[PDB]
Each structure stands twice: as structure tokens, then as C-alpha cells.
Amino acid sequence: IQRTPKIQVYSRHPAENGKSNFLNCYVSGFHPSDIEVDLLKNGERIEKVEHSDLSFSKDWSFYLLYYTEFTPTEKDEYACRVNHVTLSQPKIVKWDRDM
């Protein structure tokens, strides 16, 4: 029984340009657990990215949080690239500071 990841890209604190924040990509509801998650700054992977320990929900589906320390600007584009066995193509979700 397999399940496609849900994705939410967002920040720990409301985006104040030039202030330091955290960029979060939260993937939930997937199965099996092996997942490929990257944070992108202008199409380029960010190296120093950490993530929480693997757990799962009442319906056995897994969730992880990926996060990196960042400082939003007016112009920099950020995203989250996710691949999974269930995804024939990677999903790339753009950061939006409003959701």
C-alpha cells in the first residue's frame, strides 16, 4: 500500500526580508519511507540542510521536516524538490511567503 507525499513550503517566522528565519519543507502522508527532499535557492540545491527523525501518523504514513537557516530577500526564489517512489517526476513547490 503506497501513498504520495504532501508538501508544504513555509518559514518558521513570517518573512521579514533581510531578517534571519528558517525555511521549512514538511512532507507528510507518504509511504514507503525512503524520500528525496532538497531545498533550492534559485534552482540550486542548498547544502547545509537538516531534517527531523522519521516518525509517522495514525494511518502509518510518514512525515519529516526539512529545514535550513536562511534570510529572505525580495528577489531570491526558494523551493522544495521532492522525489518518491510514487512520483514519476519530482514535485518542485515554490516557497510563497503568504502560505
Added chain:
Amino acid sequence: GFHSLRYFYTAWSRPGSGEPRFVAVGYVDDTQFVRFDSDNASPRAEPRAPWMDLVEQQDPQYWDRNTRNARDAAQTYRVGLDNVRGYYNQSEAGSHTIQRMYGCDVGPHGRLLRGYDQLAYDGADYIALNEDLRSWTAADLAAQNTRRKWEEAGYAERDRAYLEGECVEWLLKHLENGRETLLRADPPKTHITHHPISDREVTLRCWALGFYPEEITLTWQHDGEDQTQEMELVETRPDGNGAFQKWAALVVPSGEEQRYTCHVQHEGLPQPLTLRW
């Protein structure tokens, strides 16, 4: 009120890429406090909550006693993966997963309320401890095998004894040592934002930030008329600092923003909030 100590185990094969991996985590209520990852060189259980730093002085043996258990668990589920796949006669080339979710709920009485021990295989229910803490409910033919060996090995009784003693005792210790983190209810920081779609439609988004515990309700009301099906509600999500966030949004006509209200309920709130743009 009630609280819960839980343990989540994940074990899965990686055909080709090496031996099976076993990751276990533990939670009190809605916050992790320990972890164990079999892919470490000499893997040990580790603290994942600041209040766990003072666990050694109440009982230093904690970390060794735990590490030994995690290592053994790790072995038990490696062997399990092989027997279960064998029951099904599945090709060794496919990855497969065994899960586990056991713990206890205790209440204002400081006595148990529910114990549980449940297993999934490839993400579906496989076998679970019945609420009587003595029989097992097997999901399919292959899980009868697991049940029979577990019946004969007396594992239900091993579970009941743990769930009704050690589990309760430790859930109470943790609540005591984690009293600042664990016995709080941080109400959400709420506000509303405003994003114009066109000149005749505008998106209202109602934000709940930095709250704990996870359980929360957010709704929109149009002149006191609930708007649940008309609204977009995101899954609750962690902020990375031990709290949670959530929003609800809905599109309203570009002059009737004033006629909508967001309603917020949460354990930390003395009364439920009503917000308006």
C-alpha cells in the same frame, strides 16, 4: 486531562543498498524526546528534548538500558522482515517495511487509560494487541502466523506488564522532568492576511502560529454562517521549534471582507478568538 507516552519503530529492507534500517523515536504528548538510528556506527539512543539532559542523574543506566533495547529491537525486526516476506513469498528484490506504535495513555488519576501495541506491514494494519491486553487481532492469513508464535511465546503478557507498569511510571517521570515543555499550552498567535486575486475577488487567510499542543480548530464565518466547505484548510505543520502552525483561507468578494470572521479554539486560549479584517 490526559497524557501519553509512545514509541514509534520503523524497520525496512533496502535490497541492494545494504542491510535493513531501523529507526525508532519516542514521544510524550506531541513532542519527541528520544531517537535511535541503526545506520550509526555504534548506534545509541539519544536525547531529543532539553529536559532529557537531567535524565541520567535520576537514572544514568537509562541510556545503556535503552541502547541495549533499541539494538535488540533492531535485530528482532530485521528477522521479522524476513519471516513476513517469507509468509507472503515476496521477491527479495522489493523493499518492505514493518512499523510499530506502542505506548500508554494516562489520565488525571495518574493511572493508565489505554495501552496499545500495533504493527503495520507495508503501511497496512498487520497485527495489534487487543484492548484486553491478552489476545491479538491478525489482519490476514500471514499475520495468524505472527499471532501464533506470539501467543506461544507469551508476548501479550509481556506487553500488558510493561504497559501497566513501566510505561505509566516513565510517562509520569517525563511529565515531571519536562514540566515546562510538556505541561504548557501555548495559545496560537493569530492574525489575518489579505491577498487580492482580481479586482472582484480577494483571498482572506487566517493564521495560527506557534501553538502547542497540535489539536486546534479554525473556521471562517460569513455573517455567522459557517464556511467549512468553501474554505481551504492546510494540514497542521510543525514550526521546527517544538510548536505548530495552521491556516484557513477562503475567497471573498472585493468589498465584503468586513462580513467574514475567523474563529480559533485551542487549549491555551482562555476564550475562543474571533478575528476580523
